[PDB]
Amino acid sequence: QDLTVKMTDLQTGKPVGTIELSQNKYGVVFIPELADLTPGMHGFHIHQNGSCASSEKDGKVVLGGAAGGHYDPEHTNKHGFPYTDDNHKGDLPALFVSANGLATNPVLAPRLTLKELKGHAIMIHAGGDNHSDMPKALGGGGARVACGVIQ
Amino acid sequence: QDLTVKMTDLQTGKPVGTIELSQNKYGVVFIPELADLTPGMHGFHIHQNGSCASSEKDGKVVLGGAAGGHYDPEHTNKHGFPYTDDNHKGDLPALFVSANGLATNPVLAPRLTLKELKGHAIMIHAGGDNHSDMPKALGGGGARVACGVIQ
Ligand SMILES: [Cu+2]
Ligand SMILES: [Cu+2]
Ligand SMILES: [Zn+2]
Ligand SMILES: [Zn+2]
DSSP, X not given: OOEEEEEEETTTOOEEEEEEEEEETTEEEEEEEEOSXXXXXXXXXXXXXXXXXXXXXXXXXXXXXXGOSBOOTTOOOXXXXXXXXXXXXXXXXXXXXXXXXXXXXXXXXXXXXXXXXXXXXXXXXXXXXXXXXXXXXXXXXXXXXXXXXXX | OOEEEEEEETTTOOEEEEEEEEEETTEEEEEEEEOSOOSEEEOEEEESSSOOOOEEETTEEETTGGGOSBOXXXXXXXXXXXXXXXXXXXXXXXXXXXXXXXXXXXXXXXXOOHHHHTTOEEEEESSOOOSSSSSSGGGGOOSEEEEEEOO
16 A cells, blocks of 8 residues: 655656655655765655646746646645644655765655645755745755656 | 753764754654764664763773663664654654754654653764664664753
């Protein structure tokens, strides 16, 4: 009953690994098994649409823009922590990438359930995430680098 | 009703910052505000005794050995994840240290409560933590580098 999600690099078009999702007494667990990522902490979020295609914006291209914004079932219109209820239910803890470019440190999302995740897409950004909309919106994750649809 | 914990470097004897503890619907939140630490992921645990003094072992010195082993109220005798019940209730998520040596990424402990933490000590190790006793016990955190008693 556990889920496996294939992740692809939006830039190169090549796969960077897989993320396994599981449900437990305390929430959903995201177990990463990725590679070819830049070291550091990465913005890690569940997005609205179940797609990783591109989108257009004022004449420019947005890799993984079809996924839309962050998963916000309660229409909170705010970005925040994984343990605060007044923000995107899709706000996951940041994803850590080792010096060798690997990601295998599991993360927990207390406000989520497996059933509701299907049809949505997991997203990995280039910048980090300070879990706020200040001083940079959406935690400063910036561009989208890796993406995967949860089927 | 929130707690502030002073942390000291066991080696140099100098303070490296403070960690703020708070309680919320989903557990205890550890908000770090440290510095002078080596980049990477660090083993982060709550230990048994409320002390950071040294201890002796077979003729050798153990910095922060007086704190004892990991907090294990249920006497599970196993090291594991922060979201599994059959292991040290004191198993916290690993602590991330930036390239500039700062630690400010908050962490959540679902199985803990503030009241029970007092009298214990927060510990920071040199190695990481793979949340298991294999292939290295206690997640491979090795030596203790920073410590703080929760009063
Ligand atoms: Cu995102
Ligand atoms: Cu420890
Ligand atoms: Zn968000
Ligand atoms: Zn432990």
